[PDB]
């Protein structure tokens, strides 16, 4: 029943364009506030997005998004060292409400609300007071799983919807609740909703990417793929060995899940320990594989655009063997 990426193949199709076509990867929200060249917004986690990855994101035809694990101040001031478009992130509280109207006089104009089960009552809250509050300014909000969900999301007033729960990215969310939707069928049914949904989740391949936007997603976000990465938050570490790792102690959007899924509670006694994430070299070739892998797949297709690509969607549904 329920699939994700590694589940589907995409079929080739016949492809009408000159071999040295320049193929176009850009794409513009239902809404028509936001376009980017390169359909691609690094994650709202504390380990991917500051303004060192917002601006290599935004120097890449791209975009970041700001996580919201900052004071207020610290979020105006790394807000204002973003070149170009980036999204801050905001939560549900009444200091998150102040957070978002600090945001808005300080100049942002892109917007995301960011909880773990955005399918609710206080969320829907939120977004009615966030749009009366933002005007005519780009809201995104999520995460939802479900049509309804992104329905919901849309009638309290986003503009684009973040779909993924955690069935295909967040392990821990589906080993502790037992919940969660695999991302195909999640992208696909969100986007039966109309507004733009953002695939947030499973993502390891450019060929995943490929497969999010063909089964309907406008952008994808990717963290996993950036992890450690130079423009990431943190010093990279040398250590005896020769090999180099960037290393976390705090690690703010885990622990927010971890809140969420009940798991940090009064007998969580075991001693902190540092994360450690191997030093990714190259981030402009990371960049380059995805802006390549993405043009081979239009060309497979024979698709002028991402809408062409997602008109014309024809898959075939693999086993393990099928790998």
């Given at each position: 029943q329920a699939i994700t990426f590694d589940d589907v193949l995409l079929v080739p199709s016949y492809n009408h364009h000159e071999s040295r076509r320049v193929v176009e990867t850009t794409s513009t929200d239902r809404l028509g506030k936001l376009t980017l060249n390169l359909p691609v917004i690094s994650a709202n986690m504390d380990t991917i997005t500051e303004s060192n990855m917002a601006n290599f994101m935004?120097?890449?035809?791209?975009?970041?998004?700001?996580?919201?694990?900052?004071?207020?101040?610290?979020?105006?001031?790394?807000?204002?060292?973003?070149?170009?478009?980036?999204?801050?992130?905001?939560?549900?509280?009444?200091?998150?409400?102040?957070?978002?109207?600090?945001?808005?006089?300080?100049?942002?104009?892109?917007?995301?609300?960011?909880?773990?089960?955005?399918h609710a009552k206080?969320?829907?809250?939120?977004?009615?007071?966030?749009?009366?509050?933002?005007?005519?300014?780009?809201?995104?909000?999520?995460?939802?799983?479900?049509?309804?969900?992104a329905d919901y999301l849309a009638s309290c007033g986003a503009d684009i919807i973040k779909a993924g729960i955690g069935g295909g990215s967040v392990c821990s969310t589906r080993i502790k609740t037992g919940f969660g939707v695999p991302m195909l069928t999640c992208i696909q049914d969100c986007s039966r909703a109309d507004r733009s949904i953002v695939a947030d989740?499973?993502?390891?391949?450019?060929?995943?990417?490929?497969?999010?936007?063909?089964?309907?997603?406008?952008?994808?976000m990717i963290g996993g793929m950036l992890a450690g990465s130079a423009p990431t938050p943190g010093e990279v570490f040398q250590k005896d060995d020769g090999s180099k790792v960037k290393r976390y102690r705090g690690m703010a959007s885990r622990e927010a899940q971890e809140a969420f899924l009940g798991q940090m509670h009064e007998w969580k006694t075991a001693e902190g320990v540092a994360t450690e994430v191997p030093f990714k070299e190259n981030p402009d070739g990371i960049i380059a594989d995805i802006i390549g892998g993405l043009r081979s797949g239009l060309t497979y297709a024979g698709a002028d655009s991402i809408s062409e690509l997602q008109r014309k969607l024809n898959y075939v549904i693999v086993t393990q063997a099928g790998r």
């Open positions: 935004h120097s890449k035809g791209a975009m970041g998004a700001l996580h919201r694990f900052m004071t207020i101040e610290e979020n105006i001031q790394e807000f204002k060292k973003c070149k170009g478009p980036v999204f801050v992130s905001v939560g549900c509280t009444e200091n998150e409400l102040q957070r978002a109207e600090a945001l808005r006089d300080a100049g942002a104009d892109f917007f995301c609300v960011d909880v773990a089960h955005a206080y969320v829907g809250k939120t977004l009615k007071s966030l749009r009366q509050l933002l005007g005519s300014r780009c809201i995104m909000a999520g995460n939802v799983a479900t049509y309804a969900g989740g499973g993502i390891k391949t450019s060929g995943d990417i490929v497969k999010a936007l063909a089964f309907g997603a406008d952008f994808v």
